[PDB]
Amino acid sequence: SKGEELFTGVVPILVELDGDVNGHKFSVSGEGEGDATYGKLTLKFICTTGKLPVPWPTLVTTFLQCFARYPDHMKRHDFFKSAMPEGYVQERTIFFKDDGNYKTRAEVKFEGDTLVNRIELKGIDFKEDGNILGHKLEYNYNSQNVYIMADKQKNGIKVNFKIRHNIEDGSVQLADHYQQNTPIGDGPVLLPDNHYLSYQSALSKDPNEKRDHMVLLEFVTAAGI
């Protein structure tokens, strides 16, 4: 990785998302730091447009794989850091089971010493009586492993994963993710063998914060090779 080195220590992070869900327009600013040496992420997101039209947890996967910890033996698989500083593109479609789907485009990259994640979010065909438009998911998240594969034609990566949000009534709400990554430069990247990223995330609330917002603590480690 010619970007391996950019992550060697504590990185400032910055996240900006602009959203639209069923005409339900919004904005979130996030900021924290990442210490890729420990596959560790620390962040705080604020709804700058007042309250969130959806559920925080629904935005978690959208809200930084370059911060992942690839064990040494797997370094030759780090696409993420391979893209930097240049950066990469992340696009997604999130089909919420029995509900609407989100579409996402992001540009992840460096701005000086800050790692920036800029996102455009558009969700459609959501139900006002939904779990989503209805806000019935619990404020939590479960651990999970994602199946990473190389997308050569595209000089990038292709990923597919399921996410299960809990419904307050004790049920489960599926969010089928589908995803592509492509480098932002015409620069050389690291095409990986299939492996995975194992995640763990913990959401919280800021006792002092008075605004709509999310505290998230995640851990991500490469595995499978």
What are the Cα distances from residue 80, in Å, to 64, 88, 122, 143?
9, 8, 24, 21
Experimentally, the structure was elucidated by X-ray
Domains of the chain, by residue range, sit at 1-225
Give the C-alpha separation, 40 to 133, whole Å.
Answer: 31
Give the C-alpha separation, 96 to 101, whole Å.
Answer: 5
* Residue 53, token pair as written in the block: 């039209």
Contacts of 113 (CB under 8 A, 6+ apart): 11, 12
Q: What is the dihedral of CA 198, 112, 158, 97, to 10 degrees?
A: 70
The highest-level CATH class for domain 1-225 is: mainly beta
* Residue 154, token pair as written in the block: 């595209």
